[PDB]
Amino acid sequence: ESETLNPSARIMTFYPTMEEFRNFSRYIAYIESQGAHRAGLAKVVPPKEWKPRASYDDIDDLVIPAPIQQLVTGQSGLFTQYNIQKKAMTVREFRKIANSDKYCTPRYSEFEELERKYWKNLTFNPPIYGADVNGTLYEKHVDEWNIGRLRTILDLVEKESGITIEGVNTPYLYFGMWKTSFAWHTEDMDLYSINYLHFGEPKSWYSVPPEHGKRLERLAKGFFPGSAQSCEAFLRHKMTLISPLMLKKYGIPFDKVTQEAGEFMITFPYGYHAGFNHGFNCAESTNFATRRWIEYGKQAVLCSCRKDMVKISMDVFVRKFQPERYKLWKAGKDNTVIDHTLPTPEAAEF
Ligand SMILES: O=C(O)C[C@H](C(=O)O)[C@H](O)C(=O)O
Numbered sequence: 001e002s003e004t005l006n007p008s009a010r011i012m013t014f015y016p017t018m019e020e021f022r023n024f025s026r027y028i029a030y031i032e033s034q035g036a037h038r039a040g041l042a043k044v045v046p047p048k049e050w051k052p053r054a055s056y057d058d059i060d061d062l063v064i065p066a067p068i069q070q071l072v073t074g075q076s077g078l079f080t081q082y083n084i085q086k087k088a089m090t091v092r093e094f095r096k097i098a099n100s101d102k103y104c105t106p107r108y109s110e111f112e113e114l115e116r117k118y119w120k121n122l123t124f125n126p127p128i129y130g131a132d133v134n135g136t137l138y139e140k141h142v143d144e145w146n147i148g149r150l151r152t153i154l155d156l157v158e159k160e161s162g163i164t165i166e167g168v169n170t171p172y173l174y175f176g177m178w179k180t181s182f183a184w185h186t187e188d189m190d191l192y193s194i195n196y197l198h199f200g201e202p203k204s205w206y207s208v209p210p211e212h213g214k215r216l217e218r219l220a221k222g223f224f225p226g227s228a229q230s231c232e233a234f235l236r237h238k239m240t241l242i243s244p245l246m247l248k249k250y251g252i253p254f255d256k257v258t259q260e261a262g263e264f265m266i267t268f269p270y271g272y273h274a275g276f277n278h279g280f281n282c283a284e285s286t287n288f289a290t291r292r293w294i295e296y297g298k299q300a301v302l303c304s305c306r307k308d309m310v311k312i313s314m315d316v317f318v319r320k321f322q323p324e325r326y327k328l329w330k331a332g333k334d335n336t337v338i339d340h341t342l343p344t345p346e347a348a349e350f
């Protein structure tokens with residue numbers, strides 16, 4: 001029944017009306033009822049009515065505390081990205097560096113051309129990424145799809161323990177320029193993410209279906225054996241870049257999509273994704289959960305080498321939503337197997 005919908009696990013695009021846009025968890029349950037999650041990634045275009053902020057002229061003086069210079073080493077479609085932290089700078093400062101002739105977007109015809117240039121010049125002229133900036137660009141009273149307060153069950157983490165994990169249950173802002181990259185990864189604890197591109201040049205995405213995620217890992221282990229030996233989940237370091245031709249070459253299924261200013265992307269539990277920014281832009285993101293995520297959370301394979309320290313205690317979730325399995329789970333005898341094609345239970349309404 002669920003296998004029926006989006007059997008090609010292709011990236012789907014949604015155009016919710018305002019009535020649908022109002023309830024966040026509801027619409028997530030909906031797009032999953034349509035099989036959107038099978039691609040690991042979905043685009044959601046909000047109603048033209050809606051805007052999260054009246055004007056982005058207010059922000060040239062906002063500080064980016066920890067700009068990141070992205071050095072990329074590799075060849076033949078395989079790369080490792082090293083971060084070099086630069087001194088703080090303002091949005092105005094960043095935009096100036098971004099739009100400069102040294103760092104700006106090259107001229108091109110079709111998207112495929114910008115993409116080939118990206119994979120050709122990835123290792124040259126290392127760009128700067130205004131990344132992991134704590135903050136939101138939502139106006140205080142915007143009640144729809146507010147990344148600052150989506151009100152999903154991920155809230156049980158702060159609610160129960162007071163713990164906040166930056167960018168995960170709090171928002172992050174990402175200022176990009178041409179050729180700035182995000183490496184292949186799933187979210188921490190294999191959560192969902194929501195990504196809103198406030199303004200600027202597009203952000204292009206690659207994605208691998210969760211049902212084929214393990215195959216991408218096998219490949220990654222094979223190409224980076226030293227990293228594989230030192231960490232059980234080295235892709236969580238977010239340093240590993242792998243071109244579409246390489247995936248194609250080794251039969252890893254994947255899809256592409258380009259995100260325009262004013263568009264949302266949703267990534268789904270155990271959805272590997274990666275991509276790059278086209279030029280100067282600004283994106284806001286955080287993680288979130290649904291009931292379906294819980295099993296992913298329980299089974300998430302985490303970074304063992306301490307480079308990624310994000311760890312959420314699953315105990316509250318299993319107690320509250322899997323009471324019949326708590327004893328079993330707590331005693332390590334819970335061998336539930338995950339079906340990546342099933343939608344979250346909240347979609348029973350649909
Ligand atoms: O850019 C990154 O380093 C992570 C990325 C982002 O937040 O832009 C993430 O893929 C996501 O959107 O969930």
Ligand code: NI
Pocket residue numbers: 185186187193267273
């Ligand atoms: Ni991500």
Ligand SMILES: [Zn+2]
Pocket residue numbers: 230231232233234237303304305306307308
């Ligand atoms: Zn690690």
